[PDB]
Design a protein around this motif. Structure first.
Motif, PDB file in Angstrom:
ATOM      1  N   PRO A 109      55.973  44.606  48.987  1.00  0.00           N
ATOM      2  CA  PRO A 109      55.434  45.964  49.036  1.00  0.00           C
ATOM      3  C   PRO A 109      54.224  46.137  48.116  1.00  0.00           C
ATOM      4  CG  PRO A 109      57.810  46.043  48.956  1.00  0.00           C
ATOM      5  CD  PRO A 109      57.434  44.609  48.757  1.00  0.00           C
ATOM      6  N   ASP A 110      53.284  46.976  48.549  1.00  0.00           N
ATOM      7  CA  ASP A 110      52.060  47.273  47.799  1.00  0.00           C
ATOM      8  C   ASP A 110      51.092  46.094  47.663  1.00  0.00           C
ATOM      9  OD1 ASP A 110      52.368  50.142  47.186  1.00  0.00           O
ATOM     10  OD2 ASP A 110      54.069  49.479  45.951  1.00  0.00           O
ATOM     11  N   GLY A 111      51.259  45.073  48.494  1.00  0.00           N
ATOM     12  CA  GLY A 111      50.318  43.949  48.510  1.00  0.00           C
ATOM     13  C   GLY A 111      48.927  44.380  48.958  1.00  0.00           C
ATOM     14  N   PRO A 112      47.918  43.510  48.772  1.00  0.00           N
ATOM     15  CA  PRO A 112      46.549  43.851  49.191  1.00  0.00           C
ATOM     16  C   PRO A 112      46.397  43.948  50.711  1.00  0.00           C
ATOM     17  CG  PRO A 112      46.649  41.573  48.556  1.00  0.00           C
ATOM     18  CD  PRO A 112      47.967  42.180  48.142  1.00  0.00           C
ATOM     19  N   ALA A 113      45.595  44.904  51.161  1.00  0.00           N
ATOM     20  CA  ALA A 113      45.335  45.102  52.588  1.00  0.00           C
ATOM     21  C   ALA A 113      44.671  43.880  53.234  1.00  0.00           C
ATOM     22  CB  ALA A 113      44.479  46.349  52.794  1.00  0.00           C
ATOM     23  N   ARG A 135      43.083  36.136  35.981  1.00  0.00           N
ATOM     24  CA  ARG A 135      42.981  37.275  36.870  1.00  0.00           C
ATOM     25  C   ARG A 135      41.809  38.153  36.461  1.00  0.00           C
ATOM     26  NH1 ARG A 135      48.604  40.578  35.621  1.00  0.00           N
ATOM     27  NH2 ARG A 135      48.120  41.334  33.512  1.00  0.00           N
ATOM     28  N   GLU A 136      40.878  38.317  37.384  1.00  0.00           N
ATOM     29  CA  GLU A 136      39.672  39.106  37.154  1.00  0.00           C
ATOM     30  C   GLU A 136      39.719  40.257  38.144  1.00  0.00           C
ATOM     31  OE1 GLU A 136      36.700  36.080  37.639  1.00  0.00           O
ATOM     32  OE2 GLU A 136      37.147  35.134  35.709  1.00  0.00           O
ATOM     33  N   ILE A 137      40.220  41.383  37.654  1.00  0.00           N
ATOM     34  CA  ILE A 137      40.566  42.524  38.487  1.00  0.00           C
ATOM     35  C   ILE A 137      39.674  43.697  38.141  1.00  0.00           C
ATOM     36  CG2 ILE A 137      42.384  44.168  39.067  1.00  0.00           C
ATOM     37  CD1 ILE A 137      44.285  41.674  38.272  1.00  0.00           C
ATOM     38  N   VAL A 138      38.918  44.147  39.140  1.00  0.00           N
ATOM     39  CA  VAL A 138      37.914  45.198  38.961  1.00  0.00           C
ATOM     40  C   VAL A 138      38.107  46.292  39.998  1.00  0.00           C
ATOM     41  CG1 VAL A 138      36.240  43.678  37.860  1.00  0.00           C
ATOM     42  CG2 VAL A 138      36.218  43.902  40.368  1.00  0.00           C
ATOM     43  N   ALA A 139      37.818  47.528  39.611  1.00  0.00           N
ATOM     44  CA  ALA A 139      38.154  48.683  40.440  1.00  0.00           C
ATOM     45  C   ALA A 139      37.009  49.702  40.562  1.00  0.00           C
ATOM     46  CB  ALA A 139      39.441  49.364  39.925  1.00  0.00           C
ATOM     47  N   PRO A 140      36.056  49.457  41.472  1.00  0.00           N
ATOM     48  CA  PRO A 140      34.969  50.422  41.605  1.00  0.00           C
ATOM     49  C   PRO A 140      35.396  51.631  42.440  1.00  0.00           C
ATOM     50  CG  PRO A 140      34.616  48.620  43.143  1.00  0.00           C
ATOM     51  CD  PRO A 140      35.925  48.333  42.417  1.00  0.00           C
ATOM     52  N   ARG A 141      34.975  52.828  42.034  1.00  0.00           N
ATOM     53  CA  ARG A 141      35.168  54.011  42.878  1.00  0.00           C
ATOM     54  C   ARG A 141      34.297  53.849  44.134  1.00  0.00           C
ATOM     55  NH1 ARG A 141      34.158  56.275  37.653  1.00  0.00           N
ATOM     56  NH2 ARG A 141      32.075  56.938  38.348  1.00  0.00           N
ATOM     57  N   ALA A 142      34.576  54.652  45.160  1.00  0.00           N
ATOM     58  CA  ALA A 142      33.795  54.624  46.403  1.00  0.00           C
ATOM     59  C   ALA A 142      32.299  54.745  46.135  1.00  0.00           C
ATOM     60  CB  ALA A 142      34.250  55.737  47.338  1.00  0.00           C
ATOM     61  N   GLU A 143      31.945  55.485  45.079  1.00  0.00           N
ATOM     62  CA  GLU A 143      30.542  55.761  44.741  1.00  0.00           C
ATOM     63  C   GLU A 143      29.910  54.635  43.930  1.00  0.00           C
ATOM     64  OE1 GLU A 143      30.076  59.276  42.205  1.00  0.00           O
ATOM     65  OE2 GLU A 143      31.571  58.499  40.776  1.00  0.00           O
ATOM     66  N   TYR A 178      42.160  42.629  48.205  1.00  0.00           N
ATOM     67  CA  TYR A 178      41.573  43.959  48.197  1.00  0.00           C
ATOM     68  C   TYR A 178      42.637  45.028  48.453  1.00  0.00           C
ATOM     69  CZ  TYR A 178      37.024  41.570  48.630  1.00  0.00           C
ATOM     70  OH  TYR A 178      35.927  40.748  48.447  1.00  0.00           O
ATOM     71  N   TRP A 179      42.716  46.011  47.554  1.00  0.00           N
ATOM     72  CA  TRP A 179      43.616  47.161  47.686  1.00  0.00           C
ATOM     73  C   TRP A 179      42.805  48.425  47.971  1.00  0.00           C
ATOM     74  CZ3 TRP A 179      44.432  43.046  44.597  1.00  0.00           C
ATOM     75  CH2 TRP A 179      45.745  42.497  44.544  1.00  0.00           C
ATOM     76  N   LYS A 180      43.423  49.394  48.642  1.00  0.00           N
ATOM     77  CA  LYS A 180      42.731  50.630  49.029  1.00  0.00           C
ATOM     78  C   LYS A 180      42.788  51.726  47.963  1.00  0.00           C
ATOM     79  CE  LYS A 180      43.188  49.829  53.993  1.00  0.00           C
ATOM     80  NZ  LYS A 180      43.454  50.364  55.360  1.00  0.00           N
ATOM     81  N   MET A 224      39.493  45.157  43.541  1.00  0.00           N
ATOM     82  CA  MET A 224      39.130  43.797  43.919  1.00  0.00           C
ATOM     83  C   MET A 224      39.738  42.860  42.886  1.00  0.00           C
ATOM     84  SD  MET A 224      35.177  44.685  44.387  1.00  0.00           S
ATOM     85  CE  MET A 224      34.448  45.398  45.860  1.00  0.00           C
ATOM     86  N   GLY A 225      40.746  42.098  43.306  1.00  0.00           N
ATOM     87  CA  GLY A 225      41.500  41.242  42.397  1.00  0.00           C
ATOM     88  C   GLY A 225      41.311  39.767  42.687  1.00  0.00           C
ATOM     89  N   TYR A 226      40.622  39.082  41.785  1.00  0.00           N
ATOM     90  CA  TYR A 226      40.356  37.667  41.918  1.00  0.00           C
ATOM     91  C   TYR A 226      41.337  36.941  41.039  1.00  0.00           C
ATOM     92  CZ  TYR A 226      35.802  38.788  44.106  1.00  0.00           C
ATOM     93  OH  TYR A 226      34.809  39.237  44.939  1.00  0.00           O
ATOM     94  N   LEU A 227      42.200  36.142  41.672  1.00  0.00           N
ATOM     95  CA  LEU A 227      43.325  35.479  41.011  1.00  0.00           C
ATOM     96  C   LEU A 227      43.111  33.981  41.113  1.00  0.00           C
ATOM     97  CD1 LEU A 227      44.264  38.354  42.004  1.00  0.00           C
ATOM     98  CD2 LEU A 227      46.540  37.485  42.243  1.00  0.00           C
ATOM     99  N   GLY A 228      42.999  33.311  39.973  1.00  0.00           N
ATOM    100  CA  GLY A 228      42.620  31.911  39.962  1.00  0.00           C
ATOM    101  C   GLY A 228      43.630  30.900  39.450  1.00  0.00           C
ATOM    102  N   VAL A 229      43.560  29.695  40.019  1.00  0.00           N
ATOM    103  CA  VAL A 229      44.263  28.526  39.504  1.00  0.00           C
ATOM    104  C   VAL A 229      43.222  27.452  39.181  1.00  0.00           C
ATOM    105  CG1 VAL A 229      46.102  26.863  39.874  1.00  0.00           C
ATOM    106  CG2 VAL A 229      46.220  29.091  41.022  1.00  0.00           C
TER     107      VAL A 229
END
Ligand code: HEM
Ligand code: HEM
Lengths: 350, 359
Positions: A73-77, A132-140, A98-100, A43-48
Motif C-alpha cells: 500500500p502507498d507504493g509509487p504510481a 535514498r535521494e528523495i525530493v518533493a517539488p510542488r506542482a509550481e 514517483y508518488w502523487k 521523486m524518490g531515487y533509491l540506490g544500491v
C-alpha cells in the motif's frame, strides 16, 4: 497557443518572460498536464552501490526487494530502474519511484516492511552501499518538456496527460518560464549543502541536508523503437557529444555548480540493459544549470543537431523534467557509500 | 561597499539618468554574477539621440577604384566642415554580387547637428548634383538615429572605444547584464518598459531599384542595427593566430550565411567589412554591419546558429587571458521616422533595396 503552465497555476505575473506573447516556437514540443489534485509530487531515487563483480548477485536481489516493496500500500504510481558505473569505478543500481502526494510516500517509507528493511543492521553488514535521494517539488516547482505525446516516462507518467503544442520553448530562458512559480519567484538559491549526521570519511550512515532551490534535471533518451538509421543517428552522432558533456559534468561538477552528475542506462528486473538512458543531475542552483546548457559546447552541439533533425525524428524519444525544492523537501541518506557518492561529494562536513 | 562589487552592487549597463521602475524584468536574479568582466559606453543626459551615418561608394570594375577612392576622400573632406561627425572610420567589402563597397561611417552626438550638415550647401549640393547619376559609381546613405534608450554597447576592453562608443563620455566599470542570452535586450534602457517589437514593412517610397538611379527606402519601427567588431592590430602573434586561425574562418562562414540567407532569418542586409586608411590600405580591424527585421530575429540567430555559437564558446574559453585582442558590439533600434536609406545607381541587392516592397 497553449501554455506550459497549467490553467489552475496561471496567475498575475510579477516577473515577465524574455520573449513577447507573439513568440512562435520553431518546432512542436509538449508538456505534462495535471489538475489541482496534483499539488506536490515525490521523486524518490533509491540506490544500491557495489565495487566488485561478486557483489552483483546481492546487489540485484536488493534491487528486487526494493521493487517488491512498491506493491505494498502507498507504493509509487510509477517507477524505473537504471545502472551506471561512477568515476570511482563503483556500480550503482538506482530505482526511481514517483508518488502523487507527500503523505503517501511518507506512509510508505515509515511502514514496518519498508522502515525495518532500511533501519536494519544488515544494511551495515551486507557489504553494499545504500542511498535514498528523495525530493518533493510542488506542482509550481517543476517543468516537463517532451518531444512526443505518448507513454510519458519520468514524472510525466504520474500526471494526467499530455498538452497540445506549447509556446514557451525553443529559446534559452524557456525552461525557467515553464516553472509556474517563475511568474512570481526567481527560484534563487540560498544556504549550503551540509552534512547533519555522520561523517562521509568514515562510512556508515550519513545524512546530508539540502538547501533552498537546488535543482534536479532528469533529461532522457529513448531509442528502443528506432530503426537502423535513427539508431545510428542517436548512438553514432548525438551520443558521443552527449557522452562528452556527461563526462565533463561528472568530473568537473564543482567548477560549474553541479553537485552530482549521473548518466544512467535503464535495466529490466534481471539487470539486462534496455535502450533508454537519462541524466540525473543535481545543481547548486537552477541558473547554474541554465548557464551550462546555454554556454557549454557539448550541449550546444546536440541542441543544434536537434534543431537540424527534429522534423525527421519518428521513434527517437527525447524529454526532460526539471525541479527545484525547499530545503525541507529534500532528504539525502547514504549508508556505506564512498565519499564521492551523490550529495556526499560537495557536502560541507560538520 | 567592498573593493570589488558583486551581485546587485555591480554597475548596471543602464545609465543612471536612464534607469526607471521596470515593468519588464530580467531573466536572471539580481545576485547574478558574470563569469568575466565586460564594459559599456557611458554618457550623461546631454546625449539624447545619436546619428549613425553610413555613407557608401559602390563599384564593380577595376578601373573605377581611383574614382571611388577620390569620391570617398571627398565625403571624408566634408567631415572637416562645420557640424561634422565627432568620429568616423572607413571600410571596404565585396558583396555577393562581386561589387566593391567603400563605407564611411560618421557618428554625431545629436540629431540637429547632422541635419545642419546634411543640408549645408557644400554637402547637399554634392549629393543632389546630377553628376552622381553620370559618375558611373554607386552611392548610398544609410542614416539612422537611435535615442539614448535605444542602443546598447558592450566592450571586452576599457580603452579607445570604436563606433558610437567614441562619441560617448567614457567607459563604465564592470557591468552586470552580460554573459547570457537575453542580456543584449536587457542592456537597452528602453527594455525596462518596452518589448521593442517590430511593425510595418520595408517599403520603397521613391524611385525603382530595378531601373537604378535614385531610390529611397522607408524603414519600419524597431529595425535593429548591429555593428559587431574585431580589432587585432596591436595584438601579439598568439592572439593574432587565435583570431585569424580559430575565430575568423567560422565568423566568415556565419557572415556568408547571413549575407546569402538573409530573408530566411530576417536579416535585411549583412555586411562583413574590413577597415581601411584614406589611401585604401587594409587595417587589422573589421566588423559586421547587419540590419535586421527585428531584435528578436537577431536574438534567435545568435543563440541558435552553429557559427555564432562556436565562436561564442571560443571567447568563453579564452576570455580569462585575452590581453590585446579587441572585440565589441553596438546594437540599435529606431523608430521608422529615425531611418533614412537613399540609393543612387546601386544594384538592386544593395542594403535595404534587396528586401523592400515596390510600387
Ligand atoms: C542528447 C540529448 C539532448 C538533446 C538532443 C538536447 C537538446 C536540447 C534542445 C533542442 C533544447 C531546447 C528545448 C526547447 O526549448 O525546445 C534543450 C534544452 C535544455 N537542455 Fe538539452 N539536450 C539533450 C540533453 C540534455 C542533458 C543531458 C541536459 C542536462 C544538463 C540538458 C540540459 C538542458 C537544459 C537545462 C535546457 C533548457 C534550456 C532553456 O530553455 O533555458 N540537455 N536541449
Ligand atoms: C569575433 C567574433 C564574435 C565572437 C567571438 C562573439 C562572441 C559573443 C559573446 C561572447 C557574446 C556574449 C557577450 C556577453 O554578454 O558577455 C556575444 C553576444 C552576441 N553576439 Fe557575438 N560574437 C562574435 C561576432 C558576432 C557577430 C558578427 C554578430 C552579428 C550578428 C554577433 C551577434 C551577437 C548578438 C546578437 C549577441 C547578444 C546575445 C544576447 O545577449 O542575447 N556576434 N557574442
Amino acid at each position: 497557443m497553449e501554455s506550459a503552465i497549467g490553467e489552475h497555476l496561471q496567475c498575475p505575473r510579477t516577473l515577465t518572460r524574455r520573449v513577447p506573447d507573439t513568440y512562435t516556437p520553431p518546432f512542436p514540443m509538449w508538456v505534462g498536464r495535471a489538475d489541482d489534485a496534483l499539488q506536490q509530487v515525490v521523486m524518490g531515487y533509491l540506490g544500491v552501490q557495489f565495487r566488485d563483480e561478486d557483489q552483483r548477485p546481492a546487489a540485484l536481489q536488493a534491487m528486487r526487494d526494493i521493487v517488491a516493496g512498491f506493491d505494498l500500500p502507498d507504493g509509487p504510481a510509477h517507477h524505473d530502474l537504471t545502472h551506471h558505473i561512477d568515476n570511482q569505478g563503483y556500480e550503482n543500481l538506482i530505482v526511481v519511484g514517483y508518488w502523487k502526494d507527500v503523505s503517501s510516500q511518507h506512509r510508505w517509507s515509515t511502514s514496518t516492511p519498508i522502515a525495518s528493511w532500511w533501519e536494519s543492521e544488515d544494511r551495515l553488514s551486507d557489504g553494499l552501499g545504500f542511498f535514498r535521494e528523495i525530493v518533493a517539488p510542488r506542482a509550481e516547482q517543476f517543468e516537463t518538456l517532451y518531444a512526443f505525446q505518448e507513454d510519458l516516462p519520468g514524472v510525466g507518467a504520474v500526471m494526467d496527460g499530455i498538452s497540445g503544442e506549447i509556446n514557451e520553448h525553443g529559446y534559452w530562458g524557456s525552461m525557467r518560464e515553464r516553472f509556474p512559480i517563475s511568474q512570481t519567484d526567481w527560484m534563487q538559491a540560498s544556504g549550503e549543502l551540509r552534512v547533519i549526521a555522520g561523517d562521509p570519511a568514515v562510512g556508515g550512515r550519513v545524512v546530508v541536508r539540502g538547501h533552498d532551490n537546488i535543482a534536479l534535471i532528469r533529461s532522457g533518451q529513448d531509442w528502443a523503437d528506432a530503426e537502423a538509421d535513427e539508431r545510428s543517428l542517436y548512438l553514432d552522432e548525438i551520443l558521443p557529444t552527449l557522452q562528452s558533456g556527461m563526462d565533463f559534468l561528472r568530473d568537473n561538477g564543482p567548477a560549474v555548480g553541479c553537485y552530482s552528475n549521473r548518466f544512467v542506462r535503464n535495466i529490466d528486473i534481471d539487470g539486462n540493459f534496455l535502450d533508454l538512458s537519462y541524466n540525473i543531475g543535481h545543481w547548486a542552483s537552477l541558473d547554474q544549470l541554465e548557464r551550462w546548457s546555454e554556454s557549454h559546447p557539448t550541449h550546444l552541439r546536440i541542441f543544434t543537431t536537434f534543431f537540424r533533425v527534429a522534423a525527421g525524428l519518428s521513434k527517437l524519444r527525447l524529454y526532460h523534467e526539471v525541479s527545484v525544492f525547499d530545503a525541507a523537501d529534500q532528504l539525502y541518506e547514504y549508508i556505506n557509500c564512498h565519499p564521492g557518492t551523490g550529495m556526499l561529494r560537495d557536502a560541507v562536513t560538520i
